[PDB]
Subunit: 141 residues, 12 copies
């Protein structure tokens, strides 16, 4: 089973920026770390990142079409794109929203999510380890 | 390293009446075994009483011990619980079995989330094990 | 047929005082007034009062295991206790919420109820006799 | 003592998508009324104007009112006003549990100036309203 | 110049109630007072009351058709009817909203009028005298 | 295959200050189209909530569809909504003007959540297009 | 009987420009008309204007101590000043709020008044004549 | 006469995803169906779809300079995009906002729109036929 | 001549991560109240039901109350109703300035029914409130 | 050590209207009491009152320059004057807000204060003693 | 060519700030020199008195003189100000020294902004100099 | 010394329609004035426009990485885009927001900006000159 991990706006600048907020692991490094861990779990992971909403929707259609699960961290889109939420609503396989930071201890507007109500589950504020714990849930279903 | 798992009211009624599946005494064994398997000691206690929860959260404060907590309904009502928890130096992880952001609008706000290290929602009984794992690393 | 009447915080000092917004009847004379009406319609009503939210929950628990119906007047907790709502959600058997005073005349915080949406029905502002009226609903189903 | 039972718009439709038509409820009420020594005058209208005149008449004659106003329960100040004048008890009644439903059904204009409220106890709620009046 | 005085629902009950609100004058006397003042001011006045919205809507249509000013006290309808407002918005002549009591000192729900924004002017809380001040406004324009 | 077209408060006043064209021209226009489509259309207009509620009850009992333009009652009357909810056949809300370009209070509608669909701002043809949707159900 | 007419900030600017929002009558001409009208009514009108809040407080204080009625158009202070409210609260004689323009046909902030809920009545939109009308209310006490 | 029919994010999935509403007609077919209807009415219907907000913006820019009509189903963007609204306001030919499903009967955030207050009119909940319906309006006016 | 000083949830934790412990607090309050002609009973509980019992006893005994209900200030309708019953003065004290804090701390169920409130003046609040009671 | 007791609008009229609510103590009796109290404690109280916002500003500016502590009862301006807050935030010394009446048992608009969030503390509802209690806090720091 | 620079409450206190480091006296001299460098005359006044502010605004209205106004807190609280300012027929520029959008919620609404020609915020005392430069060109 | 001037969606069509709300000067003419002016200050301006949020985020990343200041008119995204705010938050050099029109004289949705609270400052309503007055600030530091 393939499992898509999809990262949204600004997330390709992970590690080089905001290390005190998002940890020091880079995104090139995130991919490898997650690839390694899906393998160990008997899963295969496609980890991708984009600053373009249109790209994100395309990858979401692709997963919806393959019946593939999806670990999504939309960055700021989470609280703004109806378009995104509509795309993830097609997903037969489970959907796990992840955010490295604790969205709830942060600005007011980061506390409302157009995606949370249609997701299997959500993990927030557990750093980069939030992706791996998401794989783990999927590997068990 | 001792890890505190705390379950708020009505959580003694787990399993009985439908999600999963698992009962409370069962959940105790899953977590307890998983924890040791990770090299951790876990006490798991449930309570229908705010004062009992506050007491456990005080004892864990004094003891600098990490806390994992499904406070339940009190998540959305209790300022006392929130202030009890703010004292914690060790990580605190909020766990909810169901996906609360897909429920009534009043479970969509949590007094605990903004003072918590992290939050895990909608992943079932597995949530606890995942919190246990995060703690094993930090 | 075993009907449960539960009374939450502050109702213990009924009659006693204040007696003008709730009326003359004591808590003990309430038990007895119900206990008799319980007979007059053929059921065996259990009446209990506690200021402790936890006792109440324990009692709602029992009634759920027993599949026994519930008449509930949970003082102020009505408006602030999700856990009390949650425990009441479990009732196979009917739940009648009763408030002695017309809570819709009183302060605004008193005009929303967490219990109201998961209850079979609500009786409000018919005084002490409202408990009795709801005993009669249970007789008829 | 003549208790008035007034029923609002759409309530003549009773029994359609309790198969109790309006006409049947009038008989279940009138029985219980006298099975308690009271005269119950049960009426229905789709006209706000009409209901307002009915409440006028009860106002002018110190008679108790049991009111299920339907929609107008949430919309009508003119109805709130008229029911304010009732010196005798007013008991607002609704067959379904309005709190289990849409948010707009959760506010009532009537509830605050009413003596008491019965909700979602089906049709026996009208009857219970009477038993209360039975005690005055 | 014919001027229209229209009164909404419950306004036939002037005399009752409260005598505290409201005041002493019955609808009849008010009707008689208005006609007296209107002649005295050199205008003909037609005072009608109804508890019926459609009835009030027709009285307004005719005033639109005839280019007659209206002095309007709609009772509750002030705060609830788009129909009435829509209808009054067709009046080419002046429209003066009048209320007997001080609606800004009463229930929050009375502090909003659908008519106020499309009226020429508004007089409130000045009792029965209000109609006669409205009258005077109309006579000078 | 009958379609009820019901207009609400004020729409009697059409053509004398929606668009031009009178109410009488409207009924005429709606019939010719309904016939052009193998439908019979009964177009009535009241100012009374009572009169409307009643027509809705009749369409309910007869399982006829309704094109409704309730005027201001769209935004005020829960009564009108409950009667409309009874309908088993389609219900199509229509407005002549664009209710979303006007005052705020006109931008929420008690009917829309329980209607099949809504047509706003396309003037009088708004009714015509609605019948045509009913033609293909 | 002494009657006090008090105009708040900007109302010294009356007549000049001249707005079609307010009349072409200057604030001087307004004084003349009121005192004149009051004389015809057998009242004695003192008409004063200020841009200073504190000065309006002093005049209200002075009206309170002499138990004289007040016709008030506080301009915009209506909407912002609690201090004016508290000072007007202590009047025993009537207080009639007057605005030249219809303030419900205007912007949102002009549609709440700190004063309305404590005034005897309010006249809004009838132009300069509103002051004369309020005089008539007062002449008839 | 050229009419532009513009479909927003996720409308490429038309037919493949949840059919209760939006139906079982794919996007390809709709273009055929729209194209045929235009022939019948003596119109040329250009039908296009993009997940790219910038691609939509460009198409709407073009429709403006050409003064061509626009039928627009912007999907989610309806509720989240100001850029879209602004470009649309900029059109001089009519703009019919079309939505396949009854937006007003779903989640509250689908109940407010950016485009509607600047649209000629709006069609909702009439399925794929809305688009045919909007064409008819355009054919006559 | 008795004053009740009742302390809510978490306040048993004082001086531990403010400085002054709860045992110091009682010490301070008792002496100062003695210095004023009063006798002060200073109780503290994390349990809502116990606070109710302490407020009940005081309503019965017509003794004044000083109350730092902790978080219970913003959640407990029960507690408030219990305090509504008090006939002698009810003074609300918070050690910190609850208005410079989170939004939910800027609203109290209690304040609207207390004689008055003292906020943000640390431990001296209690003593200050004892001094309002000496004078009445 | 000098303490600034500043009283806002209407407070000059203490001891006159509204003996219930504000007490029987006059402002002159207040200025005296506070002065005697200061002596007993080792402080020198400077008590001033004004209905003028510009004046209170002046006074707070002066306290700021002298790094003197301020006890302020701002009257209405508590709820309205951002300019007041601004001047107060400049104080190095403690700032204790005082209200004679329990503002939290009165109109909602008094329930919220611009100053409270930047005050050392607030004492409300204890009548005139509240000024002496504030003094006494400043005597210990 | 006369330009009115009007400073509202608390602005007499610049330099004993918390808001730059320059004083009101000094700012008066900055502005005057720049205005003259720009072919203009700037009258710079500050008052803590709303009534005073209205007067100057009345005068500049009657003179059809443009206005640079930094109204302090009154920006958020005075309709009387809004009203006085609406009368001006020459441009009105609202200036603030500090970024108001980055502070309290109450600072994010203005009675003036809606009827100002334009607004300049966050750019320090320099905001006054640029405002002048716009009036210099139009 | 590089200064990035970056313009959002729709800004390409500057000059063309409008010339009322923001207009007259085309985007090219704009690029020329800014350049002519940036030089006279001893700066170099890079002026780019785009309809694409991704592209906009890309240019902010570049400025962010280069430590160059940014004058940004994001247009609509001012109000809608978290990701752009997060991208802007990483800049270490001043960020200045500019809008040609006065955004506070317009619709309510335009009266809130995600970037103002993280910008150095904002210039609004001075049209094109805003940009030139923004360079001028940068030249001073
Ligand atoms: O807006 C949000 O809720 C949000 C946005 C983002 N944006 C992505 C981002 C923002 C700033 C900087 C980076 N980065 O990785 O350099 C990445 C992340 C997160 C999170 O993972 O917790 C949450
Ligand atoms: O309101 C909540 O946030 C909440 C409350 C609760 N309450 C405990 C509870 C309520 C109903 C039923 C059970 N149960 O386990 O049978 C347990 C649980 C959960 C959860 O982890 O899904 C979330
Ligand atoms: O929060 C409520 O709506 C509520 C609270 C209460 N509180 C219980 C209570 C409070 C104060 C005093 C008494 N009592 O028994 O004198 C009882 C009662 C009722 C009622 O039955 O109408 C309703
Ligand atoms: O809701 C209102 O704004 C309103 C309603 C009404 N309703 C008419 C009314 C209601 C109850 C009783 C009577 N009456 O005359 O006994 C009359 C009047 C007035 C008024 O003239 O101040 C204002
Ligand atoms: O409040 C509304 O949404 C509303 C009210 C109405 N009211 C009907 C109406 C009011 C005033 C005048 C007329 N007329 O035809 O002269 C008709 C119509 C429409 C519409 O179809 O756009 C919408
Ligand atoms: O804010 C208000 O409600 C308000 C303000 C004012 N402001 C006083 C004012 C503003 C602009 C111009 C003038 N004037 O007379 O030159 C006077 C007047 C009126 C009114 O009398 O209708 C209402
Ligand atoms: O609900 C509140 O705003 C509140 C809560 C509390 N909670 C009591 C508390 C919580 C955590 C720690 C302690 N403590 O022992 O220092 C005390 C205190 C205060 C106060 O006195 O300012 C105010
Ligand atoms: O608006 C307020 O919160 C407010 C206003 C005021 N206004 C002062 C005031 C109003 C009416 C009468 C008097 N007085 O001194 O006779 C004084 C006082 C108080 C208080 O000390 O509790 C509180
Ligand atoms: O309320 C505002 O938006 C506001 C208030 C003020 N108040 C003036 C002020 C308040 C406190 C302290 C000072 N000062 O001179 O140190 C000045 C200034 C400014 C500004 O120029 O950016 C903005
Ligand atoms: O919503 C805004 O804050 C906003 C949006 C926009 N949208 C950009 C835009 C919209 C329509 C037309 C054009 N144009 O240049 O033709 C440009 C501009 C401006 C401004 O520069 O004042 C401000």
């Amino acid at each position: 089973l393939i499992v898509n991990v999809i990262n949204g706006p600004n997330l390709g600048r992970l590690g080089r920026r905001e290390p005190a907020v998002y940890g020091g692991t880079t995104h090139d490094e995130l991919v490898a770390l997650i690839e390694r861990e899906a393998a160990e779990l008997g899963l295969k992971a496609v980890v991708r990142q984009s600053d373009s909403e249109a790209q994100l929707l395309d990858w979401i259609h692709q997963a919806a079409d393959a019946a593939e699960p999806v670990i999504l961290n939309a960055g700021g889109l989470t609280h703004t794109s109806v378009a995104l939420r509509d795309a993830c609503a097609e997903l037969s396989a489970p959907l796990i929203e992840v955010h490295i930071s604790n969205v709830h201890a942060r600005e007011e507007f980061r506390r409302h999510s157009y995606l949370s109500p249609i997701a299997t589950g959500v993990i927030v504020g557990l750093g980069i380890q939030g992706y791996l714990l998401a794989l783990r849930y999927l590997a068990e279903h």
